[PDB]
Amino acid sequence: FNTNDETKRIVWTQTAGHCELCGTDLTFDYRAGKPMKWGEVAAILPASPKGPRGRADHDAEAHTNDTANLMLLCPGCHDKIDRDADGYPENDLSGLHQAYLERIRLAATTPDGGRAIPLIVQSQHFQTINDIPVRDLLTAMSAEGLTAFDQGIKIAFAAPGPRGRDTTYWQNVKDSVQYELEQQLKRRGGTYGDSPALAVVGLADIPALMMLGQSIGDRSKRLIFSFHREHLLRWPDQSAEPPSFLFTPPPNGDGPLALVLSISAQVPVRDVTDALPGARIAELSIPEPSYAMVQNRRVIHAFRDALQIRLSQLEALTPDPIHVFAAIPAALAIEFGALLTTQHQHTYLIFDRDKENQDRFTQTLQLGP
Amino acid sequence: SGRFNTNDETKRIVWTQTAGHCELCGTDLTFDYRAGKPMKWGEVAAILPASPKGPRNDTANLMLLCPGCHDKIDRDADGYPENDLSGLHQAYLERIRLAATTPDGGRAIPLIVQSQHFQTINDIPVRDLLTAMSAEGLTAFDQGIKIAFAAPGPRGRDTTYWQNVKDSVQYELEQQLKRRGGTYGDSPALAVVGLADIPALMMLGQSIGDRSKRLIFSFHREHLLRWPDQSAEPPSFLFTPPPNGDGPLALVLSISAQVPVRDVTDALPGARIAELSIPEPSYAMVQNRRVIHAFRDALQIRLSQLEALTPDPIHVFAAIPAALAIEFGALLTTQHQHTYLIFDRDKENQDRFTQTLQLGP
Amino acid sequence: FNTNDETKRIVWTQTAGHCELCGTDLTFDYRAGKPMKWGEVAAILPASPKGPRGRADHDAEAHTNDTANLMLLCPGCHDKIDRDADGYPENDLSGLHQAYLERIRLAATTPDGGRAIPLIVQSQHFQTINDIPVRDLLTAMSAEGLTAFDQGIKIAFAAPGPRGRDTTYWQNVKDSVQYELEQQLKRRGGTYGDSPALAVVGLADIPALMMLGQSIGDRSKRLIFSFHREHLLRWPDQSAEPPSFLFTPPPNGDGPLALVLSISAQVPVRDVTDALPGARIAELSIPEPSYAMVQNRRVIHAFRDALQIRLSQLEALTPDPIHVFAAIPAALAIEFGALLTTQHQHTYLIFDRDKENQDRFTQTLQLGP
Amino acid sequence: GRFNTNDETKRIVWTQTAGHCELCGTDLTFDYRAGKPMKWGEVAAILPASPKNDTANLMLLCPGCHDKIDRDADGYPENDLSGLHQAYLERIRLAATTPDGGRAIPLIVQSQHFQTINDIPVRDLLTAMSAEGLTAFDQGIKIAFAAPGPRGRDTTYWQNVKDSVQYELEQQLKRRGGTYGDSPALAVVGLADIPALMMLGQSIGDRSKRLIFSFHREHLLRWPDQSAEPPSFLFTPPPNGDGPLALVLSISAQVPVRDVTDALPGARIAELSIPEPSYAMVQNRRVIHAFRDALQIRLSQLEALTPDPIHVFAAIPAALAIEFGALLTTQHQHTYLIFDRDKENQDRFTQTLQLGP
Ligand SMILES: Nc1nc2c(ncn2[C@@H]2O[C@@H]3COP(=O)(O)O[C@@H]4[C@H](O)[C@@H](COP(=O)(O)O[C@H]3[C@H]2O)O[C@H]4n2cnc3c(N)ncnc32)c(=O)[nH]1
Ligand SMILES: Nc1nc2c(ncn2[C@@H]2O[C@@H]3COP(=O)(O)O[C@@H]4[C@H](O)[C@@H](COP(=O)(O)O[C@H]3[C@H]2O)O[C@H]4n2cnc3c(N)ncnc32)c(=O)[nH]1
Ligand SMILES: Nc1nc2c(ncn2[C@@H]2O[C@@H]3COP(=O)(O)O[C@@H]4[C@H](O)[C@@H](COP(=O)(O)O[C@H]3[C@H]2O)O[C@H]4n2cnc3c(N)ncnc32)c(=O)[nH]1
Ligand SMILES: Nc1nc2c(ncn2[C@@H]2O[C@@H]3COP(=O)(O)O[C@@H]4[C@H](O)[C@@H](COP(=O)(O)O[C@H]3[C@H]2O)O[C@H]4n2cnc3c(N)ncnc32)c(=O)[nH]1
Ligand SMILES: [Zn+2]
Ligand SMILES: [Zn+2]
Numbered sequence A, C: 001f002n003t004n005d006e007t008k009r010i011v012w013t014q015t016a017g018h019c020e021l022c023g024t025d026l027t028f029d030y031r032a033g034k035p036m037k038w039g040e041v042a043a044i045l046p047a048s049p050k051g052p053r054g055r056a057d058h059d060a061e062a063h064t065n066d067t068a069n070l071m072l073l074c075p076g077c078h079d080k081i082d083r084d085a086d087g088y089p090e091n092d093l094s095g096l097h098q099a100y101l102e103r104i105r106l107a108a109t110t111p112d113g114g115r116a117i118p119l120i121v122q123s124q125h126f127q128t129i130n131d132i133p134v135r136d137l138l139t140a141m142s143a144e145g146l147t148a149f150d151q152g153i154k155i156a157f158a159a160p161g162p163r164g165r166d167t168t169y170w171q172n173v174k175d176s177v178q179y180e181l182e183q184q185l186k187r188r189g190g191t192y193g194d195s196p197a198l199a200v201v202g203l204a205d206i207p208a209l210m211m212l213g214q215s216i217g218d219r220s221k222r223l224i225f226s227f228h229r230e231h232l233l234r235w236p237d238q239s240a241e242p243p244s245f246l247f248t249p250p251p252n253g254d255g256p257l258a259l260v261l262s263i264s265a266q267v268p269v270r271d272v273t274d275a276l277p278g279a280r281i282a283e284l285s286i287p288e289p290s291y292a293m294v295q296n297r298r299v300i301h302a303f304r305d306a307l308q309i310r311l312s313q314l315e316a317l318t319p320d321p322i323h324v325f326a327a328i329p330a331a332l333a334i335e336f337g338a339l340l341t342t343q344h345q346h347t348y349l350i351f352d353r354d355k356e357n358q359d360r361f362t363q364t365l366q367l368g369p
Numbered sequence B: 001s002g003r004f005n006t007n008d009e010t011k012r013i014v015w016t017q018t019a020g021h022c023e024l025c026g027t028d029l030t031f032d033y034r035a036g037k038p039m040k041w042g043e044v045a046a047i048l049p050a051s052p053k054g055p056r057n058d059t060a061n062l063m064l065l066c067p068g069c070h071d072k073i074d075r076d077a078d079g080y081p082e083n084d085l086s087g088l089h090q091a092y093l094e095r096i097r098l099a100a101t102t103p104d105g106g107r108a109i110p111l112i113v114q115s116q117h118f119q120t121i122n123d124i125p126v127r128d129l130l131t132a133m134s135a136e137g138l139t140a141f142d143q144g145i146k147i148a149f150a151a152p153g154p155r156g157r158d159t160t161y162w163q164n165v166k167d168s169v170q171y172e173l174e175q176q177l178k179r180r181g182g183t184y185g186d187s188p189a190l191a192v193v194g195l196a197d198i199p200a201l202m203m204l205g206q207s208i209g210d211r212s213k214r215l216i217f218s219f220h221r222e223h224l225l226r227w228p229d230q231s232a233e234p235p236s237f238l239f240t241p242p243p244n245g246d247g248p249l250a251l252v253l254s255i256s257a258q259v260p261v262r263d264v265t266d267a268l269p270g271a272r273i274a275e276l277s278i279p280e281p282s283y284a285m286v287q288n289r290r291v292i293h294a295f296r297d298a299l300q301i302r303l304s305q306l307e308a309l310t311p312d313p314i315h316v317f318a319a320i321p322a323a324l325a326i327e328f329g330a331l332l333t334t335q336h337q338h339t340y341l342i343f344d345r346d347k348e349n350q351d352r353f354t355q356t357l358q359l360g361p
Numbered sequence D: 001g002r003f004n005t006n007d008e009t010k011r012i013v014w015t016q017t018a019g020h021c022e023l024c025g026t027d028l029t030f031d032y033r034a035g036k037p038m039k040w041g042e043v044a045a046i047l048p049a050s051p052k053n054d055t056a057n058l059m060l061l062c063p064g065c066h067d068k069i070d071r072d073a074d075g076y077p078e079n080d081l082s083g084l085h086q087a088y089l090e091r092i093r094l095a096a097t098t099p100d101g102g103r104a105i106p107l108i109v110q111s112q113h114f115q116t117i118n119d120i121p122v123r124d125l126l127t128a129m130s131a132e133g134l135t136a137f138d139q140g141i142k143i144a145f146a147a148p149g150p151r152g153r154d155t156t157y158w159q160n161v162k163d164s165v166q167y168e169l170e171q172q173l174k175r176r177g178g179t180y181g182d183s184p185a186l187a188v189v190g191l192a193d194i195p196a197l198m199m200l201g202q203s204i205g206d207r208s209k210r211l212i213f214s215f216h217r218e219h220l221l222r223w224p225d226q227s228a229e230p231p232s233f234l235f236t237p238p239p240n241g242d243g244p245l246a247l248v249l250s251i252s253a254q255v256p257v258r259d260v261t262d263a264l265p266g267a268r269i270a271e272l273s274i275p276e277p278s279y280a281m282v283q284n285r286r287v288i289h290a291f292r293d294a295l296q297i298r299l300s301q302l303e304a305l306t307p308d309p310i311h312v313f314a315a316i317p318a319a320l321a322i323e324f325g326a327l328l329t330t331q332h333q334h335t336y337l338i339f340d341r342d343k344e345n346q347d348r349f350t351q352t353l354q355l356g357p
């Protein structure tokens, strides 16, 4: 009941020589520098019914060389699973094993889609941890055929100080987007080239994400990704159709012009007029506002095209600034800003919810020429 | 034209780093072995340099191809390609490597939070969370965090009490922030289960948020910390909006059971009741984590509607599973904050709903 | 040639059940939660001369139960050392083995010194990485019997923006020290009690470390540690005698009063009068200014004692602010600030080298009342 | 009065305490060390830390310390000891996990010239690292300086060198790990021209966990003698005068003063040397630290002496050139003008690098 050499070689091959339970590279010893095959081929169901996970109904003979029953493991993970059969049951190991092999198979069968710079931009203005994993962006990239020369750029804004999101805070945000990011992109010019693709995901203040989009909007190969509460960086549903984007035009008059975006949620009119008395409200919405609505990149593009029409319509109404009140997903805030890089050179005054002022909207950044 | 010769050590390295697929068409070159036939490594694949011959083993630059793809590649007399494939080849190896290291993306912090009541009658040992974590690839590397909500002081569960609960949980959560590792230095995931009164669980959600790699687990009366049925579809979440009027706005969540309307109006005279329910309310309804996500999505769609109706507080009367209470609290951690007044039944006052927690302005 | 159970028990004991080469806990499986002894007792010199590191002059019988030859290793580390004898030679393993055992013995014989909050404060104002390892502070704490309930507080200032250390930069520094730090200490109020000991090390802007010192100067049980270019967080020499702190009193006059601290290096008088024309210079120095001079905490105490006298004497000369020009180690910058909380309530205007003005001194923070 | 334990409980408690009394620190394996049988149950007592099970709350005490503890009839303590017990276990744990503080990045930096005559392989740095407890987790970084363009090694060239080195390291320093999430240590060896090595030092600094290694003609990347004391460093102060201030470093060899005044007429020469200048003098890392300490003591004097640049003429080993560069990375910056020998222009010194404002 000994696994033969051919089967052991298949196990090493189908796992790419990494431990299926911890991911460590079993083909090399990085401490001393020698190539060495230090993994072990491990049986889920043992040959003896008295072994760990042993069961009589298992016919050892029939599965000695069955790779569905054989994992590549490091010595430590192998020792643990054999010392704790109840804690590493057959069904759980089999499920992890099949999931591991399937990730390899999908990687091997994905067409090459070129290089991109991974870019994560995140704030600290929430009262919870806010952290996008680098691995998840790289995995979403790979699923689309994109790879990177390095793990990329990850910018975390300084947290608000004791006065909240004050002038200092927004200066820091400006410096992070317009100076820190630019410096880190310059350091990648030699490895990625003059005009590289940018695989960008943000989870940060809405005004900050708009400023980010304005800063990078003139990059022709920007590839927007999205953090999703359920799916993390995985697109929820590549087949989903974008929603209708409904628009209500502003009333006539000379009051300040407000653009209200009700996409993540319905922005209450009372909160807009409280912050901007006399506002003339134009609203872009979807039928069922929802935090979950960024189902794929086509949704993002459909938002962009809907917005492009309405920004033209509003800029034709007035030379004065447009005041923005947005409950929108983070990926849509980036795309909003990218429309302002060149296509829409009007002044936009971005309002945002203010925890220091009982959730009222207050004016934050000015965007535009 | 020519063929590139390699020794056997080089073939084994190349087969391993490519996982035995052709790098140009993706075909799995172990097909013979899968059919029960001998694996003829040297006949079902060709190994060639990714780049044309330069002016000057180097296994990192050798490609694994199927015979068909190899024959389609123009080659010089030494078996080098006439056109560069290094970009495609390096990208192939990077995609394999990223998949192969994916298990270290499961580095995780276990967190169990219970009330004193449930710690006394229904203690959840770390072993129960750890084995459920391990089954879905979440791997703890240090002792799990097991804490109880603090007993209230003389002022009861006032604003300061709840802020102290949040501070205490978030202090423990500094492990999630700081104990970075794996291939990329990512912060570890949080694996969290709660069993406590619904207001306390909402404050646990307030503490953890929903903008990090975080997996909620659920204690189930029959299945403990294992998910009852990973294939179960989430139920429909039904909603009835409130009647129009000036009375206080109440949101009733009838998910574990049907909350009787009279208990709500008794506790909140004049209440205008909106209700979120499922077709068959049940203590057992958290069949998998997708049920929790689906609850969140439906809830937020309706909270958007309710919050727009009035500036005044939403008064919450919830019969919901513990994991759903955590997600409810986590949902309300945006910058935007509407006022929510959470009621909970007092067993020592005839099970009457009493206001227990305020969220927002 | 079979190591007996008594000796295996001693090996497990003297290593505290961790892998001597990677430090992993071999008494417990953290993934599934079962106590398990999954380590291996490993021989440096093998019983057979044909084994890894084997040699003919090794009397295996004589060393079967010789704990100098027996390491506790995890299965992975043990596999590697047996697969690459040239990369893990006998003398190198023996040295690592003995060093590991001595660290355990020293920890076990250290008298208890109570609990303390670990605090690391570091800037990003250098043109190189600046990063104090958490482990090294905890290890210096443990060498003095101090332990903590968590790995502690680590505050990293925001980097200077594109304008250098501007008003925004110093506002961020103030917020990091006066708000961020206080919030982090507040979260620990219950765990550590009311007036806990504070084990603090800084490597940050001199004016910022002085402000840090002022913020913690009224604390009881403040325990300053020091980052040293040779010894990291270890005190260089506990037996070293503190240097004499030489003092040159200021000239009589009506010009602005400057305190020059020449401890790390000699501050050139020319640079002080350039920044503050007509300065009346008082100077505190040591006989041989040196970056390495913080040999132990008694040196910091001696600096405090000297400053007590000299600040009193300068403060009696004028009601006007005192202008500070300091080339001093980071630990002494904290100590200087700590004297301003209650001992010396006078206005101090801190100058610092300005990389945006050709290394000239420019005024930065104002400290004191 | 006595709490009783079986063998398995003893195994656990002895292991988590490393076999010392938690109250006085005495090593309770003394008998075994003397060659006598280990009498676990007689050289120590185990009792709960708290008045009143879980092996985590059982303490190991020597008989004397156990005798001084008031106990109830079941052997539980009357007074709580859990704080001292938990602190003791923490100190043991911190020591036992110290090997994971060795996570490290290998870095080999060479010039094309020295790569041709003396290529340093990663394997050699890794084995020296491993012997010191430094543990790489991925491929080592092996780089060489770019060739200059037509403007030579000017300000822009050296700034691009620094930027490329720091970028290369950034990727690895993000790979935090171990028990506390610390960034890995840098293990660096350089073999290139002295100016390039100083710029390597400028890139890495000296305010992080970083260990320099040294290539030695006899011992390669292994330290010649870990026990060797560092040499004394002999200082010649510069004469008074108006000429340009020169610092001559005669560490590898004695630099002839005439070669300096030829390159820099009128030079006021300060010198730092050792009693026996030698290519072999980097006997251990403490020699490098001692060089930095002596150097900075004198640089403090020289920088205070004049606002003008310090002109550097250095016969120093490669590892010391790196540390020279790293020393000059404070906010404070004095101008240094670095000279180097042009072996094909009759070994004449020529200015090749400026550090400072
Ligand atoms: N419900 C609601 N929200 C309103 C209202 N008026 C303004 N808002 C703001 O809209 C955003 C809605 O949340 P989101 O998750 O759809 O999008 C945010 C936003 O793009 C960015 C910053 O967050 P924040 O400042 O909280 O803005 C929130 C709200 O204040 O990041 C996105 N984001 C936040 N958390 C997450 C997360 N967990 N996952 C993914 N994206 C997130 C109003 O009336 N009602
Ligand atoms: N039947 C019914 N229940 C109502 C009504 N109005 C309010 N409720 C409350 O809803 C919860 C329903 O029980 P659950 O098991 O689905 O969820 C609880 C809850 O999230 C948390 C605290 O429990 P409790 O304070 O009893 O709230 C219970 C009920 O009073 O923990 C969950 N929980 C409690 N025990 C368990 C358990 N053994 N296993 C798993 N989860 C548990 C109303 O009108 N009717
Ligand atoms: N040589 C010299 N230095 C001068 C002069 N005028 C002002 N200075 C400043 O004094 C400090 C001397 O360096 P240090 O290492 O002794 O102390 C620093 C200081 O306490 C803090 C911030 O650094 P910085 O802003 O560079 O101040 C440096 C200098 O500008 O951190 C300490 N620090 C910096 N680097 C390290 C390190 N690697 N290890 C330990 N502590 C460090 C003047 O005329 N001459
Ligand atoms: N004898 C002598 N040398 C002088 C004088 N003035 C300047 N120098 C330069 O000092 C260096 C001394 O050699 P080293 O081996 O001690 O250090 C070199 C140096 O750090 C780096 C580059 O070499 P180079 O440009 O030749 O500088 C040489 C000399 O010109 O690398 C070090 N290095 C070079 N080769 C090796 C090697 N094989 N092993 C180890 N380190 C090496 C003067 O008057 N006299
Ligand atoms: Zn493993
Ligand atoms: Zn093919």
Ligand SMILES: [Zn+2]
Pocket: C019, C020, C021, C022, C023, C024, C073, C074, C075, C076, C077, C078
């Ligand atoms: Zn190990």
Ligand SMILES: [Zn+2]
Pocket: D021, D022, D023, D024, D025, D026, D061, D062, D063, D064, D065, D066
């Ligand atoms: Zn004792």
